[PDB]
Design a protein around this ligand. Structure first.
Ligand SMILES: O=C(O)CC[C@H]1COc2c(ccc(/C=C3/C(=N/O)Cc4ccccc43)c2C(=O)O)O1
Ligand SMILES: O=C(O)CC[C@H]1COc2c(ccc(/C=C3/C(=N/O)Cc4ccccc43)c2C(=O)O)O1
Ligand SMILES: [Cl-]
Lengths: 150, 149
């Protein structure tokens, strides 16, 4: 059920890890900088996400997070169906790849305005979600979910 | 009114919980911080505005209203920074009641989480999903979707 489907994505910059959740149907994202991708960090990130949006299903970004007892506990707690992230549809890889490149580009364009990477990442989230493509990802996610509620 | 948020700072376990409330829906986001500085508040607002269409923020106190860092974040994110003076006196009691409710939920989950920040995010989840019959999460999406359309 596509209003509730999210995909996890982990990318790297400046020796740090950027964890991204993408609302598949809209392209809307949330993201955080973490020192390393652990089960505990991923679990906490998912808890935050699911408190903020109606997360029904998460396609996990790798097998370690899929396997993680802590991630499984968070998904249980928050009522999330934890699934694999195998791109049975091969265009999924390229879409995530393209978004990571886009995000890193935006981070570069703002990096000087922020002392810390985490600030630049949140600026990138803002720019990404507001970008008009003509609706924005932020507009699309609200519309999709509102239509589902109705 | 679809774009109006209110900041709220409350305390528990010698730590600070910073809350943003979407006034029309009662929907919240929250974080635990060591202390409420301009820098922490600024970063919190940047996060919020990247996630929801934040037009106006009623700041929680005069220090954050005055803060150059908070003003910079509001400028960056296109947020109108306003005071949080309750010209409508029922605003105080509503925020008061929510802080009490949140602390209650935190108590009900505190044992399930080692760290306060986890308990706070559990509380955010429970608050936003609670049916009152629609939930705050349902109301915010409906309000904003109607505004877009
Ligand atoms: O560094 C960061 O940002 C996050 C680091 C840690 C913060 O603390 C935690 C964390 C990750 C997990 C936990 C534990 C959970 C449970 N244990 O049963 C049940 C549960 C249900 C849902 C979510 C988390 C937990 C904790 C915690 O124990 O509080 O992420
Ligand atoms: O501890 C935590 O979680 C948050 C602490 C810090 C994280 O870093 C920061 C922070 C708060 C502020 C900044 C600086 C900003 C600017 N300077 O011009 C312009 C700007 C525009 C918008 C938002 C932040 C900033 C930084 C930073 O410089 O990166 O919050
Ligand atoms: Cl304080």
């Amino acid at each position: 059920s596509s209003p509730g489907i999210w995909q996890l994505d982990c990318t790297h910059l400046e020796g740090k890890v950027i964890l991204v959740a993408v609302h598949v149907a809209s392209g809307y994202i949330e993201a955080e900088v973490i020192p390393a991708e652990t089960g505990q960090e991923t679990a906490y990130f998912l808890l935050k996400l699911a408190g903020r949006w109606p997360v029904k299903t998460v396609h996990t970004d790798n097998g370690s997070n899929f396997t993680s007892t802590t991630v499984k506990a968070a998904c249980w707690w928050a009522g999330i169906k934890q699934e694999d992230g195998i791109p049975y549809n091969p265009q999924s890889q390229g879409v995530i790849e393209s978004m990571n490149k886009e995000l890193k580009k935006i981070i570069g364009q703002v990096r000087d305005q922020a002392e810390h990477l985490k600030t630049a990442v949140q600026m990138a989230v803002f720019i990404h979600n507001h970008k008009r493509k003509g609706y924005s990802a932020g507009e699309r996610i609200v519309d999709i979910i509102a239509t589902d509620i109705q």
